[model samples]
Target chain A: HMETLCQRLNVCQDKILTHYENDSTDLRDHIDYWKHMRLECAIYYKAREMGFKHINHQVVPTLAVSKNKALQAIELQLTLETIYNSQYSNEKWTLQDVSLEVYLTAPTGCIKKHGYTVEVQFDGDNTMHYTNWTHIYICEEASVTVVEGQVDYYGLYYVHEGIRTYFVQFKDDAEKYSKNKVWEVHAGGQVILCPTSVFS
Target chain B: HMETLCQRLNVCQDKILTHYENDSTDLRDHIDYWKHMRLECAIYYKAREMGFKHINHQVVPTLAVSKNKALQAIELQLTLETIYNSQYSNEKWTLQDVSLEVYLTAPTGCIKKHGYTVEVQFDGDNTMHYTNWTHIYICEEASVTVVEGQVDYYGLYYVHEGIRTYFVQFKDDAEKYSKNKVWEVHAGGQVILCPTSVFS
Candidate 1:
């Protein structure tokens, strides 16, 4: 039974992937609609076979950041809750919960930077609209390392105004203290070697 | 036993919080190490009490974006995997999977914008470092809507250069066809009103 179920799901997945590829419409056209609809349908059908009698989801809106001195940016976190009822009435539904804590920092050596460009066209023949170019960066590991023991000390880095800042980790051995350290660095090359707290 | 476990965990959490507040060292001084260490210890102890278990985690790195034309940003995605082994050898462990997909457009009424400012101080007494400020935006809800049917005479919106674009959906009665549409909008005042398809 499980093998047959797996085969059926594979067929559904393949069909979705093919549609994603060959569909003439752009991703955005259906990004909000079609793409999710396809995935939802797959899950819906799959759950039916897997003994789910009822399925529902809800999105609860909450402020990710507050009016605290610690908050550097403002954002919204929507709690997406999905509930499934089993076809077997005797079985109790299980809930697994996890919450995300977002940590944002300035790009360090761990991050890679790049630029992007694109061309746009409009409706009708020769419907040339415009072109765009922008720079972006990515980090395979969006994490930080705190090195201990004595490390070299640079005097200070200058920072500019209005640049995105990151929480920096550094160690200061000037006082011969064996401790870890964190700093705040601006996109404009300025560093705050001492900070009271780092909030996610 | 579970109640005792919860009580002990609460005690641990409180101690960590107190240490965080009372410690003279700057938060950056040991934010990464001290913060995660507490959580790791909790998980370790909790898992051990729950069952005979071998628990481990791994970080796998991959390109966040594929070579698709639609992807505008270059980024790396790190997948964090956690595994737990059950004490009962006969029972198989199950895995719960979750994934995220992004659909963006220009900031709408659902989003709110704000600016943030703060004062900075360096290490030691009389530690004057620098002052910083930045503008940020938040969204109470970032979502999209799909409308069907055809309308007429809506002109094209120009998209700006170097701005992140979002897919939009619209429908017009050009060919007397009934369908939804999508548009691409940039953070800047540029918009591509002509979209290829509306999948959902």
Candidate 2:
């Protein structure tokens, strides 16, 4: 059974690797949507099968930080809340966030830095209105001190200001049914573009 | 009874570690103070008997982000509801942020090329000031595109303009119990701090 699981994981990983090497926007988006959707659905279904009821109104899962890049410059923290949407009752009613935590360093030895860059381009050749050109800066970590009746010293870091624009990226056939506007860019939040492969 | 309890649990790890953490003028002023106090009390008592229970209020644990120096960075990220002294019961409860999320990535090979330094301080005296010395920039992780809406560009980096100097640091020891003062600097969030520790 372990062997079978490993084989399947390997196959999927290879597919992603190939997608990365190819560097196609459409391919990347497809993989991002479909692949993660499948994984979320599978996990939800499995949880239900195990009689794990009482799913919270939301379940937040953070995505791992991008390993290909040095996390030193990014506030390597991110979280996605999987609120149990009432619309999907029979389907176990849940949203799955692929990137649980923004790419980050362990609390002890690392920290994550993010660069939020939003590109604006209006083209006629492509019918789509937007592409992979948005990202968000999350939180970083440090340390603290309990002193003589005071916090003699406290760790400090920075979070990008809230977002100026509220928008969403491309959606799959399934996402169309969901509340598309629910995930808009927030005020006090930074935005960025995912690498070509991350879309995949 | 103590012997029996330890024996029944099949354990012998009895060593009490206590410290003079803090006091305050803020406990009477902010409602988050009392609410967090309850949660802290619960955690303090239960952690010894049953285990620890986490609750999200203002002020949280943090550490430093450097090595061998005495500096730290902290952030407060809790949703503060309206409150004043005696406001604990009056405060509106929000979603579960019972725990905080943080990261610290060590300066690696590429980071070395970038010439970024992650430092830590032992005295942390500089971190004790609550002045608005910390500034933050926000941006996105994607490039704006024409064919897609909010394209997913993983390598994109952006920054928000006009640094906000709202964040504060620690003060003297006598202020812990001071009313209306920020616990972890702000009134509505958890704090993150990084300490200077020796890796080698």
Candidate 3:
């Protein structure tokens, strides 16, 4: 089973690697919606290796911040009230958030010193917007426990701030039922984009 | 129980224990913390495991309009809320306002020793009138959820000034429901003040 999963993950890796390396205008032909699929694969791969067996969690699973990130930035947490289920027979309550407690170091980092450049494009013709590297790192392992419902991000990193975060990204055919938002995290000094991955 | 859990987690195996162990904190805390919680506490855990539980969500708390504080959207309006130890809900609650600053105010005498004394007036003779009120208790390990927000939205757990949330003591404040957001100050819960940033 792990073998098959690894095989699928490697396929995602190859395709994503292509997206990173081949900036060719026509690359969209083969890639299209595959980018996000690749991300889902990476996240699932990480989830599985960490021993998550069930397929009930969302592509964006409930997160737990690394202790390093948690100690340095914010303590991220998630809680679900059975209320939503208890209320209406089958209706979901509005978006439920899990509160946080942050502990930032002095000389708090700002956007300029701790930002990353992000490029967000629409699903159709190469419509895109670029954010200068001034976007601050926020939202680490923050979570909302709904898979088909709305939630938010938490517990990432803070790189100082003259930069702003919050921009939109592209989507594809597979993103039909979903919002046109694609996300990627570039870390470890390599341009390889990975979801911050998972935690406990 | 401990041995079984340990075995399930690590197979209770003794591998070649050597120097330079792969002591990644993320590995130690995340997998164990998240998995163990889910495995051990399957009461409210079933819904999450069976499938996506349409659960209510909640944010880290945020307050604005203060000196030496991070700039935010909510305006300042600090005042006495608790009736010492009376009814606890009548002094001056909001009509579900989602724009102004909101938080648990610090109690006098416990001031500076625990948290900050907020300004009493928004547009009066002394806008700098800072005073300590009754301690809005939040025991350590208590998760404070923010039921509303200016940016992050309500129904999420509280984060500090939209940054993070905390439990007080040896410490956190935090949660979520309905359209009209309100912070939960339970009957006699230890209510510690969660500030815009970390304080004494």
What lDDT does candidate 2 reach at residue B124? 30
Task: Show how many residue pairs clash in every candidate, following the order shown.
Answer: 23, 132, 84
User: Measured with DockQ on alpha carbons, how good is candidate 2?
Assistant: 0.03
At residue A7, what lDDT does model 2 achieve?
Answer: 47
> Model 3 TM-score?
0.16
- Least accurate 10 contiguous residues by lDDT in model 3 chain B: B73-82
In model 1, what is the error at residue A51, expressed in angstroms?
Answer: 51
Scored against the true structure, residue A50 in model 2 reaches a CA lDDT of 38
Could you give candidate 3's per-residue lDDT for residues A87-192 as a string of tens digits?
1113321111111111122112211112234332233323333323222223211111221111113113223224322232223322653353444323224332
Question: DockQ of candidate 3?
Answer: 0.02
Q: How far off is residue B175 in model 2, in Å?
A: 52
Chain B TM-score, candidates in order: 0.22, 0.17, 0.15
Q: Can you give the lDDT of residue A159 in candidate 1?
A: 28
lDDT tens readout by residue for model 1, A14-94: 664665565432222222222233333433443443564443332211222111211111110001100010111122211
- lDDT per residue (tens digit) for residues B1-200 in model 3: 23332333233112212111433222222222222222222222322333433222211122111111211110111111111111222233222211122232322111111223332121222222232223332211111111211111111123333454322211111212122222322112342233335334
Q: Where's the lowest-lDDT run of ten residues in candidate 2 chain B? A: B143-152
Q: Using TM-score as the measure, which candidate wins?
A: 1
Q: What is the DockQ of candidate 1?
A: 0.01
- A44 Cα displacement, candidate 2 (Å): 21
